[PDB]
């Protein structure tokens, strides 16, 4: 009797694919033939942020467009001042294997979670002169893989037990749980309107969720291997991924299909991070062969290379589009402009 | 006046220097015991839904650092990347609850992030094998080449040849996997749950590992 139900399910999966496929009038590449290319982009390193004992895992810009935070295997969070290279804070952690960090939209909190299944919240602006942990969110089973702030109150976490979550900081209790992934989830990104968020997992699929109703909405497939990084288009209607098979793809949101792929035959290593420019004209991706490449988001042309002594692990583009920050496994952060 | 900001930055850097010294003088170790393998006994090293279970122990003024692993589900494909720099890996196995152990051993061997890391393999509970041999150990049932096997070596006195045959049979079943690759080496030991020399064995093994590293550095070999 299981097959009966199974047959009907595969039956549905058959209808979805055919209906989606019978919509492509023309490709994204054809529609951009008329336009002149960006050309050649030369970026020169301006600063070099030093101080980390060991390999770097994450970073996140501040809304102030001047400050940034970074995390390392040592168990350190350091908040920099990207204009004058000073150090503002240096926070030591309880667990040394940390994989994520995020910087609050209002600039009051920073959070980080790692391989010990707990997301920690630190209070930066207090009547004392120290940074204290104010909440320890527990309830996941696998390691945390990403976290992002909504307000001074609500946070979204991704873990290694194939679940996402939405929390409530003052109560400290899980509010909504998003289930449906098969493999462990590697990254997530938010949306400009803070109503939807996307996620990418190691079962080679990406799903779009709704925060209020706590249920899945769509599903995009096409990647051969697991997903390492996901980013969201500034408009709110597209997003791009980066996987272990040396490919970065772009998916439409309300068209529910697969647009231009960004790949070349000289790369065999995978991608660790992706990010956009303010106008969405350039997609820049951090690679595994010690190099970071920048792409034209509309025609897939390599235009510029940001040449680190080890694997590149994180990226970032400032809210107002000044500069780009990169981190790596040899422990130095560089700001390209 | 940003001079006070510069002073704050300099004090932070001064503390980071001390942290670097302490970090650089220490040694890290990963433990990868099996499900029923009694690593709970081997972690009894006080007499010298969480995750990583950090412990610390020192012998003869050298600081060690052993990280167990907690509730990280079942797959180790992704979180094994974080341990690309440890000094050694410490198996614990039980002496058919052996075939899956061999498969796990060969999977942890010949990875892409554990290419240059040596394994300190432990054989735990070496009384189960003795009692099975003396009484129930039909090794030939699932290991047919046991019958056509024999050693010269340096056995331990007060034992029948059967127990030693079994012991070096298992030891060879691991050593052949180790040798079928010379960037790293396996270190098989026959130990028991309640022992005394475990820390000494780990000490000598790490000493040999970094001695080989230094000899490689100045091309003495």
């Amino acid at each position, epitope marked *: 009797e299981l097959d009966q139900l199974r047959q009907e399910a595969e039956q549905l999966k058959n209808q979805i694919r055919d209906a989606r496929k019978a919509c492509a009038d023309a490709t994204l590449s054809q529609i951009t033939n008329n336009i002149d290319p960006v050309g050649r982009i030369q970026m020169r390193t301006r600063r070099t942020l030093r101080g980390h004992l060991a390999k770097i895992y994450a970073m996140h810009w501040g809304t102030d467009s*001047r*400050l940034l935070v970074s995390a390392s295997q040592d168990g350190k969070l350091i908040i920099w*001042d990207s204009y004058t290279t*000073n150090k*503002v804070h240096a926070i030591p952690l309880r667990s040394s294997w940390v994989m994520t960090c995020a910087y609050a939209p209002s600039g009051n909190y920073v959070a980080c979670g790692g391989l010990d299944n707990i997301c920690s919240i630190y209070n930066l602006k207090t*009547r*004392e*002169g*120290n940074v204290r942990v104010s909440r320890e969110l527990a309830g996941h089973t696998g390691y945390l893989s990403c976290c992002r702030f909504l307000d001074d109150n609500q946070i979204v976490t991704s873990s290694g037990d194939t679940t996402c979550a939405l929390w409530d900081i003052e109560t400290g209790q899980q509010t909504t749980t998003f289930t449906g992934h098969t493999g462990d989830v590697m990254s997530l990104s938010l949306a400009p309107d803070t109503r939807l968020f996307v996620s990418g997992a190691c079962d080679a699929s990406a799903k779009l969720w709704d925060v209020r109703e706590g249920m899945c909405r769509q599903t995009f497939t096409g990647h051969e291997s697991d997903i390492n990084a996901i980013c969201f288009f500034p408009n709110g209607n597209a997003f791009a991924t980066g996987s272990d098979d040396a490919t970065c793809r772009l998916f439409d949101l309300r068209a529910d299909q697969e647009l231009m792929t960004y790949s070349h035959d000289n790369i065999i290593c995978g991608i660790t991070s992706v990010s956009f420019s303010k106008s969405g004209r350039l997609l820049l991706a951090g690679y595994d062969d010690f190099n970071c490449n920048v792409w034209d988001a509309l025609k897939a042309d390599r235009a510029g290379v940001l040449a680190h002594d080890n694997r590149v692990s994180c990226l970032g583009v400032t809210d107002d589009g000044m500069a780009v920050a990169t981190g790596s496994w040899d422990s130095f952060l560089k700001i390209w402009n | *006046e*940003d*001079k*006070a*900001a510069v*002073e*704050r930055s300099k*004090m932070i850097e001064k503390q980071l220097q001390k942290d670097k010294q302490v970090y650089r003088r220490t040694l890290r170790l990963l433990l990868l015991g099996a499900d029923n393998s009694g690593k709970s006994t081997i972690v009894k090293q006080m007499r010298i839904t969480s995750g990583i279970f950090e412990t610390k122990f020192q012998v003869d003024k050298v600081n060690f650092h052993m990280f167990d692993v907690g509730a990280q589900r079942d797959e180790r494909r992704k979180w094994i990347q974080c341990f690309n720099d440890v000094t050694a890996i410490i198996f614990v196995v039980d002496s058919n609850r052996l075939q899956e152990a061999l498969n796990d051993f060969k999977s942890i061997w010949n990875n892409r992030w554990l290419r240059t890391i040596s394994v300190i393999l432990f054989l735990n509970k070496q009384d189960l094998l003795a009692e099975k041999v003396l009484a129930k150990s039909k090794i030939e049932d699932y290991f047919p080449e046991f019958a056509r096997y024999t050693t010269d070596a340096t056995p331990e006195p007060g034992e029948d040849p059967r127990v030693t045959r079994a012991k070096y049979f298992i030891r060879k079943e691991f050593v052949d996997i180790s040798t079928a690759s010379g960037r790293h080496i396996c270190y098989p030991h026959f130990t028991c749950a309640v022992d005394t020399e475990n820390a000494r064995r780990i000490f000598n093994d790490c000493k040999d590992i970094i001695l080989q590293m230094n000899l490689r550095e100045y091309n003495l070999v």
Partner: single-chain antibody
Amino acid sequence: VQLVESGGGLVQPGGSRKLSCSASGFAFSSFGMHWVRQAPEKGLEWVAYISSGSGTIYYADTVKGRFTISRDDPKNTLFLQMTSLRSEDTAMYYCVRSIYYYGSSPFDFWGQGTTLTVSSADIVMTQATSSVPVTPGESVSISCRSSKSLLHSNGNTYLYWFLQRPGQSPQLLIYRMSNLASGVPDRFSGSGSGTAFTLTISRLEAEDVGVYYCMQHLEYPLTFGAGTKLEL
């Protein structure tokens, strides 16, 4: 967060005294510390300064070889040692907290004070008036005048307003001429052009009466203003 000062008394001229400000309730090892003097019938006046790591010390030009300042981090105690007391050192002394990093608010918390009785090229800050009569329920304005451009190359404008209530220690209202403190009600504002500054209060209640002070922080000599009392 509370600081309590000890010492004081009546001293004959030519003697020496050791004042103390004991800190309890925060991280005393991460804050710069000052000392600020108040003559009985005049505005405030700067005295000394010692930074967090004891690596930098400045003194006011009035007394430089007679006063010395030191700190003791493990016990959370701040010391001032003074020698050869003239007839001018007969005023109130306050110990003031200060922390300097991008976005911080210096001079935010003030001590309680201690009493003591004895038997050139720096920027000049002046205030237009010294009193003003008003009525509750309408806006007021206070004007401050500078003798040099306080605006710096980076873009900051270093001006502070304190508003000492009549009977207790001073507080902080506006730091760097535009930014607001933490616990102050949201009816205060500040504006300026580079040499002339104005402070506006939209409403007015019974807690707004007091004396308002105009401090600059561009260079070490710190020149305080005169003060405009609001009488109701």
